[PDB]
Ligand binder design. Structure first.
Ligand SMILES: O=C(O)CNC(=O)C(=O)O
Ligand SMILES: [Mg+2]
Ligand code: NI
Ligand SMILES: [Zn+2]
Length: 331
């Protein structure tokens, strides 16, 4: 069995290996990369996502989200308070302001310590989930707007044609902006490219141990757990590495820098934070190996998780028993 300790693997494809996206994912899995839940891919030196980032300031963040925390430093939830629209240039200036800018620090580890000590005492503003792409149309390799669609994969594997579309999303971050512990919708893969700016630190639980993290979360968030049998689908709960170590939960950590891709694998729980002003692009995708995970994915039916149009068909075809209850949650 490859990668039996479930370590995060880092890959350096050549320009020739970067041509065929599906084939490279399957290669990484042949080496055990999925066992970690997360892998890093450093593009060949010849590759670029676009020519420059000099002309992005007029992108609109229609609904910036202020991430307000409650709890204790290592165990907290966050809610998202909607703020007035602002452009990317306005948001960058805000991120760089004395109130929001990254503090002086020695290295990534010192910054990680400061994040976990102090996060809860501040409310950073995140431009998340903005439909669009920063890949140049002429970039043919690993262009997250040109991937094979999940609807086409389901049709190729299972024969059933379904409605829905699959497009990428932009994230504009600042110091302390936070992504809560989650797996993807329908336990899909994700791919995330950090286009510019400061790093993103990730934490991940191996898929084979995801139920250990769920059982800890039910203990640490007991009201939320009574409200919903899949409350981590709400994407609001944070648990620190120190607390994970105290409770014996297997995990790994890694820092992504600008110009690097991260892939999350089916049922790989992940969480993390941004070091400073940055912009990332991400999308979900599927492979043949996903289908079995999609069929077994938990679902939120309490009303909180509310998701895209395209998840309807996935539930309807892969989980027909759950469909009626899940759809009530959506309505
Ligand atoms: O970058 C972020 O805020 C969150 N991204 C992801 O959870 C991802 O790419 O799967
Ligand atoms: Mg612009
Ligand atoms: Ni994710
Ligand atoms: Zn729920």
């Amino acid at each position: 069995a490859q990668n039996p300790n479930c370590n995060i693997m880092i890959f350096h494809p050549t320009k020739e290996e970067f041509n065929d996206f599906d084939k490279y994912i399957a290669y990484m899995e042949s080496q055990g990369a999925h066992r970690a839940g997360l892998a890093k891919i450093i593009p060949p030196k010849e590759w670029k996502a676009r020519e420059t980032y000099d002309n992005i300031s007029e992108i609109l963040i229609a609904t910036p989200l202020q991430q307000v925390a409650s709890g204790r430093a290592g165990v907290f939830t966050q809610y998202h308070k909607k703020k007035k629209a602002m452009t990317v240039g306005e948001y960058r200036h805000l991120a760089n302001s004395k109130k929001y800018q990254t503090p002086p620090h020695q290295n990534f580890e010192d910054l990680e310590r400061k994040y976990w000590k102090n996060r809860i005492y501040n409310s950073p503003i995140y431009g998340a989930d903005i439909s669009g792409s920063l890949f140049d149309e002429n970039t043919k390799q690993w262009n997250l707007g040109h991937l094979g669609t999940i609807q086409d994969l389901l049709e190729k594997e299972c024969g059933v044609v379904i409605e829905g579309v699959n497009t990428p999303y932009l994230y504009f971050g600042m110091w302390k902006t936070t992504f809560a512990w989650h797996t993807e919708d329908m336990d899909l893969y994700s791919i995330n490219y950090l286009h510019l700016g400061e790093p993103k630190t990730w934490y991940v639980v191996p898929p084979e141990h995801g139920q250990r993290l769920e059982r800890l979360a039910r203990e640490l968030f007991p009201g939320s757990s009574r409200g919903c049998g899949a409350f981590l689908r709400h994407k609001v709960a944070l648990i620190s590495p120190t607390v994970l170590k105290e409770n014996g939960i297997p995990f790994n950590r890694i820092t992504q820098e600008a110009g690097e891709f991260m892939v999350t694998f089916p049922y790989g729980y992940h969480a993390g934070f941004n070091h400073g002003f940055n912009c990332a692009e991400a999308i979900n995708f599927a492979t043949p190996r996903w289908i079995d995970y999609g069929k077994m994915a938990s679902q939120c039916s309490c009303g909180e998780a509310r998701v895209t149009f395209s998840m309807d068909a996935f539930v309807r075809i892969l989980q027909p028993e759950r469909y009626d209850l899940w759809k009530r949650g959506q309505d």
